Amino acid sequence: VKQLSSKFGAISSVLNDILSRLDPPEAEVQIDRLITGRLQSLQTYVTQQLIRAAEIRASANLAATKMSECVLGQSKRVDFCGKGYHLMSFPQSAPHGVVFLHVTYVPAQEKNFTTAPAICHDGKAHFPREGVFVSNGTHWFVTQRNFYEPQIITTDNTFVSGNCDVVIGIVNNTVYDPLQP
Amino acid sequence: PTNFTISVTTEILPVSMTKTSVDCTMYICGDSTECSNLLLQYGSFCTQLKRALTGIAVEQDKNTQEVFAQVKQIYKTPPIKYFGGFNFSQILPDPSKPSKRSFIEDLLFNKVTLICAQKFNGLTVLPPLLTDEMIAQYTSALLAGTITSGWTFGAGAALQIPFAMQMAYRFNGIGVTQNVLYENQKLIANQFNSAIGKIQDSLSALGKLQDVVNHNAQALNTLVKQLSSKFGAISSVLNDILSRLDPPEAEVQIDRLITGRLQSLQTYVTQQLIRAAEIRASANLAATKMSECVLGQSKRVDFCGKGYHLMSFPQSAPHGVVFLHVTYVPAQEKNFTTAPAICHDGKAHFPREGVFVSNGTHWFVTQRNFYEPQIITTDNTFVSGNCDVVIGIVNNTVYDPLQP
Amino acid sequence: GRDIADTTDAVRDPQTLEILDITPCSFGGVSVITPGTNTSNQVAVLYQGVNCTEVPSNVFQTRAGCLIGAEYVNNSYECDIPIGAGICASYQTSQSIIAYTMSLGAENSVAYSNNSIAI
Ligand SMILES: *[C@@H]1O[C@H](CO)[C@@H](O)[C@H](O)[C@H]1NC(C)=O
Ligand SMILES: *[C@@H]1O[C@H](CO)[C@@H](O)[C@H](O)[C@H]1NC(C)=O
Ligand SMILES: *[C@@H]1O[C@H](CO)[C@@H](O)[C@H](O)[C@H]1NC(C)=O
């Protein structure tokens, strides 16, 4: 709007002050200047609007993908649906946009433990199926990766592969067989 | 497959771009008050390009933060340097330099590379906010967190772990059991050391950052070289016009030079906007790749390398970032006879975690990515239905581990 | 005489007949660092890529030009007003404008051992 009050080398800025004061065929060298300037201004405006439309189409595609993934399911991609282990996302409508409420899982209150890669019991190594091998000073337990829950060493959560002469760092411990009779 | 080959590949993505700040009033006139007065009746043309280039520079500062500034704390590595037999000495930085960059970095900053002639016409190159030392510190903090923690330091606090079981978890994440790492740890360490030693001879590609530098230099060279154009005027220098003609008759040639240089600057601004849109797309891809490959393990195919992805390591580059994708490539295949199910005592059996194979005489269960046969047992098989519906189901004995 | 930019770089004196190189006079950008009008009214002036022995209130020579009106400290805080080349400005003592190198975070060292995990 403000570019309509420029001169662009002419003697005025409005058409009626040139078409009623200047000559009819001598105002053609200034009406052309005003036309060229306003056409250049409109072309530059359309040019920046196209680039802004592309840069907002990219964000709209990104928002559509995270509405497909975080809201309509659970995503395993790191730092895509929040910061932590993603649980949900709730959409909220916004002016010219969308707001996501990413519910995530953040752990806390860690403790240090002593760790072994495998257990040599009865001359053969033992590896956990879905757990770790931690100790708090005297005895060894199997917990999960993301939550400390010490459980009794059992055949049911360990598998045996080879002997205990190849693995390095392997410690010796007993393995309870859950069969009394 | 009966064996694997650990391979380290190299991916280069541009992140940043050379900032430029152009004084549009002095570029066109320089010292002419009459040209500065003639430029006043052109509206706000000289302010919109300045605002656009300021946005370009702020965006270029913003692009580095999403890639590199992803750590709350600057992490350090204990000086023992024994991570399960894996060699990180070429990768971790050395204290014997003022900048503390690794070799692998020092081979990269040397390759990527008219003096003061662009300064006179009004073209200034602003320095980045983060210097090379701080980007190297960010990369070293991310890399030390990756070595000492794993994926745990990207989802909260940094939890310590040995490297020889972090590698076991990343082996477990691609469908291979974790006994493979504990029984081939020295072979995998030697393969990783050879694969990371071949990177120096491989790189000594890197043409993307050189293309970015060459394009950003050629645009400024063209902008300087367009000052010699006359655009129909009798001269290309304003002092020759102003020392020869009265301003009654000198408002035509200066006007022609003004309309020439305005359209010489506007096209430069628009191409810089388009090129920085491509650079911003590359920086978004680099930030997503850092978050998904460095701070975790990705299950997407051909995103963090070529093969089954284990881990990645960032390396700083001039106006870019280099990733060292470590993958799992199988080798040494064989041929076996397979069946969908096993008929025993009139009921079909299916493997819960493996395949059914035969070498010609006996039937076994292996994994899908590694060849490890074992005895047919009720522990790794489940029963569903009878031997009437499935086609191609063969007969074999199934052993139950209960003798008394 | 002409350089690669097709402009005058050298000239010959018509009387003494010796060559004289022509160098442009010094120029740069002026950036004003302001803590806020509602907060205070004292500003700092940053010259872009200009040595401090050319400009005619503590003088600081930086890779991003000469800074006038800010005091360098030897501590490190987070960035408030980014200046360039790792230098940030702030407003503390809320009495004067200070300049410092940015701090990228804290100093943490993960206790790696051969047998140590944290759960
Ligand atoms: C590789 O490991 C060997 C043996 O530990 C040692 O020379 C050094 O740590 C590494 N050598 C390199 C990186 O050249
Ligand atoms: C120009 O700046 C440099 C800083 O690198 C320093 O030598 C001095 O401040 C200036 N040079 C001279 C000759 O005064
Ligand atoms: C782990 O054990 C190896 C045994 O070769 C030893 O060299 C290394 O120093 C140990 N690590 C630490 C942190 O002491």
Side-chain angles (χ1 to χ4, degrees), chain A residues 1-25 27-129 131-181, chain B residues 1-248 250-352 354-404, chain C residues 1-5 7-119:
Chain A
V1 168
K2 277 169 21 205
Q3 215 97 43
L4 283 134
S5 322
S6 299
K7 302 270 180 315
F8 295 112
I11 67 175
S12 213
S13 195
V14 293
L15 287 328
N16 269 334
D17 276 358
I18 319 175
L19 290 172
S20 56
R21 180 62 188 90
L22 216 56
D23 227 24
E28 308 309 280
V29 306
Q30 302 170 359
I31 286 192
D32 204 1
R33 295 190 153 266
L34 285 182
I35 282 174
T36 289
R38 290 176 190 177
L39 255 157
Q40 205 57 240
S41 165
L42 194 42
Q43 277 182 1
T44 46
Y45 169 67
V46 171
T47 281
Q48 45 147 276
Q49 279 286 324
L50 283 155
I51 306 176
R52 191 133 65 228
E55 92 162 60
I56 274 169
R57 202 207 302 126
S59 64
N61 291 337
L62 170 70
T65 50
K66 43 187 53 155
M67 183 106 62
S68 304
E69 298 194 15
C70 324
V71 185
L72 272 80
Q74 200 180 13
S75 91
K76 258 63 156 149
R77 296 164 66 176
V78 192
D79 289 1
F80 184 62
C81 305
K83 185 142 304 177
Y85 301 143
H86 159 251
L87 290 172
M88 293 136 203
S89 288
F90 299 109
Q92 304 290 314
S93 58
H96 290 346
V98 64
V99 176
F100 293 97
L101 305 184
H102 299 293
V103 189
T104 41
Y105 180 91
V106 176
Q109 305 185 10
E110 48 260 7
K111 303 176 189 303
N112 307 6
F113 302 99
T114 315
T115 326
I119 295 284
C120 165
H121 176 66
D122 213 339
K124 41 194 181 179
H126 287 76
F127 312 91
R129 316 190 147 153
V132 310
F133 277 146
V134 292
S135 174
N136 68 329
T138 326
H139 334 283
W140 290 86
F141 302 107
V142 181
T143 85
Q144 330 163 13
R145 302 180 182 176
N146 304 114
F147 202 71
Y148 177 59
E149 206 218 56
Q151 318 208 49
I152 290 265
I153 277 287
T154 301
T155 278
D156 292 324
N157 38 10
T158 47
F159 64 95
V160 46
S161 173
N163 56 336
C164 42
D165 305 73
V166 193
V167 198
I168 54 198
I170 178 163
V171 313
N172 305 150
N173 203 32
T174 171
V175 168
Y176 172 48
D177 198 313
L179 182 58
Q180 300 282 336
Chain B
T2 299
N3 207 269
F4 39 82
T5 54
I6 272 65
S7 71
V8 177
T9 29
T10 287
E11 183 177 7
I12 292 110
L13 306 104
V15 167
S16 302
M17 172 192 166
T18 289
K19 317 174 190 174
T20 54
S21 86
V22 178
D23 191 22
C24 328
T25 304
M26 176 178 73
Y27 173 84
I28 302 176
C29 323
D31 62 330
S32 301
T33 318
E34 193 70 29
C35 177
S36 300
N37 273 257
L38 269 158
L39 262 176
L40 204 57
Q41 37 169 239
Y42 269 86
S44 65
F45 272 155
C46 293
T47 322
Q48 195 164 171
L49 325 162
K50 182 179 296 295
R51 164 146 37 87
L53 284 177
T54 309
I56 293 273
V58 173
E59 172 189 342
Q60 248 61 66
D61 275 323
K62 196 200 317 285
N63 294 345
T64 325
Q65 293 271 330
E66 288 108 23
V67 190
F68 291 102
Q70 295 196 348
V71 296
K72 326 129 189 153
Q73 334 266 332
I74 303 294
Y75 291 94
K76 302 300 176 182
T77 283
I80 306 299
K81 269 75 172 322
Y82 176 66
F83 313 108
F86 291 81
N87 244 1
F88 291 105
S89 297
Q90 231 66 30
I91 278 174
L92 293 176
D94 41 25
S96 61
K97 279 188 55 59
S99 183
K100 293 182 294 299
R101 285 193 277 102
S102 309
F103 177 80
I104 304 297
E105 320 219 13
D106 269 333
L107 297 178
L108 294 170
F109 295 74
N110 289 333
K111 298 184 179 301
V112 179
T113 62
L114 303 180
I115 300 298
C116 95
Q118 315 170 358
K119 186 79 166 184
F120 167 58
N121 316 279
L123 318 176
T124 321
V125 174
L126 318 177
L129 170 66
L130 283 178
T131 56
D132 269 323
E133 294 91 55
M134 320 171 141
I135 299 178
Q137 285 179 21
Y138 266 138
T139 307
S140 176
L142 280 158
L143 210 174
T146 311
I147 291 180
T148 40
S149 303
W151 50 61
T152 58
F153 84 110
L159 292 305
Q160 61 217 253
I161 200 175
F163 202 84
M165 29 204 303
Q166 171 189 347
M167 274 303 276
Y169 300 163
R170 305 185 106 103
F171 252 66
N172 235 340
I174 60 179
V176 193
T177 57
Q178 69 182 189
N179 45 12
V180 175
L181 197 287
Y182 295 139
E183 293 170 1
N184 304 315
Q185 184 176 347
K186 289 175 178 167
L187 183 65
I188 288 158
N190 285 336
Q191 285 182 9
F192 174 70
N193 293 348
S194 298
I196 204 60
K198 287 195 302 178
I199 308 294
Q200 338 177 346
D201 319 329
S202 173
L203 66 97
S204 180
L206 220 70
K208 317 177 66 178
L209 317 174
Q210 283 274 359
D211 275 331
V212 163
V213 167
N214 286 331
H215 286 148
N216 279 266
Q218 200 162 0
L220 289 177
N221 283 8
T222 317
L223 200 60
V224 169
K225 266 142 45 197
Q226 281 219 224
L227 255 74
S228 147
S229 309
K230 300 108 168 141
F231 303 109
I234 59 200
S235 178
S236 175
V237 283
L238 269 148
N239 306 116
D240 221 47
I241 307 181
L242 287 175
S243 55
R244 200 192 306 183
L245 294 134
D246 44 327
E251 285 188 359
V252 195
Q253 295 85 0
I254 302 181
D255 163 277
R256 285 168 182 173
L257 293 182
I258 279 175
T259 71
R261 290 169 187 176
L262 262 172
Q263 84 180 0
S264 300
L265 241 182
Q266 293 177 335
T267 64
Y268 167 73
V269 171
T270 56
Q271 304 264 301
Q272 280 269 126
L273 287 167
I274 297 173
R275 200 153 51 222
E278 325 173 348
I279 290 297
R280 182 177 41 191
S282 298
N284 285 323
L285 180 55
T288 317
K289 197 167 288 280
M290 170 94 61
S291 307
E292 295 216 22
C293 315
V294 186
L295 324 175
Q297 198 184 15
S298 78
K299 299 324 168 286
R300 302 166 64 176
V301 188
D302 292 357
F303 184 64
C304 306
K306 278 199 49 49
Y308 305 136
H309 158 80
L310 294 176
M311 47 210 304
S312 295
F313 303 116
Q315 300 290 336
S316 62
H319 291 144
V321 64
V322 180
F323 291 97
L324 300 179
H325 303 292
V326 195
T327 40
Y328 181 95
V329 198
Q332 293 191 3
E333 313 102 19
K334 288 184 179 180
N335 295 319
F336 301 100
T337 302
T338 184
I342 291 290
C343 187
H344 181 66
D345 283 354
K347 43 197 179 180
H349 291 71
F350 310 92
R352 41 181 62 158
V355 301
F356 277 146
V357 293
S358 177
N359 74 322
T361 311
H362 294 74
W363 285 87
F364 303 107
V365 181
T366 73
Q367 329 165 12
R368 299 172 183 172
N369 320 46
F370 204 72
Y371 180 57
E372 189 179 1
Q374 43 201 328
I375 284 277
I376 274 301
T377 284
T378 58
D379 296 330
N380 41 14
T381 52
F382 63 95
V383 173
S384 174
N386 70 326
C387 324
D388 191 67
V389 176
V390 209
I391 60 200
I393 167 180
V394 317
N395 312 337
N396 197 263
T397 165
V398 172
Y399 176 35
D400 48 336
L402 222 64
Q403 274 73 268
Chain C
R2 279 212 173 82
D3 47 357
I4 211 178
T7 185
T8 308
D9 212 338
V11 86
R12 145 158 311 177
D13 203 292
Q15 291 188 359
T16 324
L17 254 57
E18 97 272 30
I19 74 81
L20 300 170
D21 304 4
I22 294 181
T23 326
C25 305
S26 89
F27 50 78
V30 199
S31 300
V32 174
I33 313 174
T34 303
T37 278
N38 194 32
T39 298
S40 319
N41 260 236
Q42 36 184 356
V43 303
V45 170
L46 165 76
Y47 296 93
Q48 294 174 357
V50 173
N51 220 328
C52 297
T53 61
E54 196 77 30
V55 184
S57 179
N58 264 331
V59 183
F60 177 80
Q61 171 60 47
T62 321
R63 296 185 244 151
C66 195
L67 182 59
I68 293 179
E71 186 193 9
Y72 195 42
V73 319
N74 302 330
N75 331 306
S76 299
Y77 328 103
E78 310 317 79
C79 200
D80 185 350
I81 304 149
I83 295 178
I87 309 294
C88 302
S90 185
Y91 197 78
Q92 282 173 353
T93 179
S94 304
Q95 289 180 357
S96 60
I97 300 179
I98 57 131
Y100 55 95
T101 60
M102 26 198 294
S103 186
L104 312 179
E107 172 81 14
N108 189 22
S109 291
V110 182
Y112 195 113
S113 186
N114 277 335
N115 36 52
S116 214
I117 208 154
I119 291 184

